[PDB]
Design a protein around this ligand. Structure first.
Ligand SMILES: [Zn+2]
Length: 317
């Protein structure tokens, strides 16, 4: 009866028979790719095509995670870092161009969305930081891509258990919350922090009805997609299982559970969704990219004009 979906990953650069089978379950709604799955844009495009032949409705995401190493031969477009963009007189335009460039290439290789490091708002003048991230978001949207931020509500220092942050809500409100409050009406999706704020709630933000429903949906009026944090944590030696955690995440109001780097865990989370007979959240297809896969994107005028602006500003070449 209830609503939810799973986002998972694969181990390699091409699909296994096991991947093909698990992709057919309708409770699987997403796939994310990482460096280990990427050889070059051409192989990424062909991989996305193979997945869409199984499931045209999958949301396909690439995690950029602060640069993916060595896209040297026919690689992905190299974009300036946001700190370099900020120190220009036309930083807002340049951030727009960067978001449009990244989103245009990502969808040209058949993906729906990118998890971009500039939209990690708590691991980055903060009002100017919000302004430049908003401009990056306009570029992404102009290319037809939905924009994901993290980590709500914010915690960018250190902790091997799960971090706890002892600040009041009014102290969080006047600090880490401010980027989110400002981009909430512009972001299409958010990922929560793997942090407990005991002054506010005893559960991590990603399993807290109070963080997700009362502060985020209520106070911040956010109506986009809530991704869970990583419900597998493969290698961290946690106890509990991806199956109990995805139940906990959907209970709190997550739309889609992420189970990365642990196929065993993804299968347990999937069995959990099957028993629930979940159907996809009505929100979910907001993340579908309006762009399309193609190979001529680098010869288009808007692409060459975006690069010319970056170059005039001294940022590339
Ligand atoms: Zn963060």
């Amino acid at each position: 009866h209830m609503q939810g979906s799973l986002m998972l990953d694969i181990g390699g650069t091409w699909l296994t028979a096991e991947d093909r089978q698990i992709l057919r379950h309708p409770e699987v709604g997403g796939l994310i790719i990482f460096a280990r799955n990427i050889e070059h844009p051409a192989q990424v495009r062909e991989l996305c095509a193979a997945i869409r032949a199984i499931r045209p409705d999958l949301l396909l995401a690439v995690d950029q995670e602060g640069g993916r190493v060595q896209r040297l031969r026919q690689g992905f477009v190299r974009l300036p870092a946001m700190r370099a963009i900020a120190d220009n007189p036309n930083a807002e335009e340049l951030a727009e161009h960067c978001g449009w460039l990244m989103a245009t290439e990502v969808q040209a290789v058949g993906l729906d969305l990118s998890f971009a490091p500039v939209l990690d708002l708590d691991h980055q003048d903060p009002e100017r930081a919000a302004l430049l991230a908003g401009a990056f978001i306009r570029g992404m949207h102009a290319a037809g891509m939905a924009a994901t931020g993290k980590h709500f509500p914010g915690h960018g220092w250190a902790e091997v258990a799960i971090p706890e942050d002892a600040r009041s809500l009014e102290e969080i409100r006047r600090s880490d919350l401010v980027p989110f409050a400002r981009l909430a009406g512009q972001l299409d999706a958010l990922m929560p922090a793997h942090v407990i704020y005991p002054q506010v709630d005893p559960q991590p933000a990603g399993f807290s009805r109070r963080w997700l429903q009362e502060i985020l949906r209520g106070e911040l009026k956010f109506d986009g997609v809530i991704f869970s944090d990583d419900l597998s944590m493969a290698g961290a030696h946690v106890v509990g299982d991806a199956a109990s955690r995805i139940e906990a995440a959907l209970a709190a109001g997550c739309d889609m559970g992420l189970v990365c780097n642990d196929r065993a865990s993804a299968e347990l989370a999937l069995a959990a969704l099957q028993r629930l007979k979940v159907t996809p959240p009505s929100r979910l297809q907001r993340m579908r990219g309006k762009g399309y896969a193609n190979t001529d994107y680098r010869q288009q005028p808007r692409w060459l004009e975006a690069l010319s602006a970056l170059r005039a500003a001294q940022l590339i070449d």
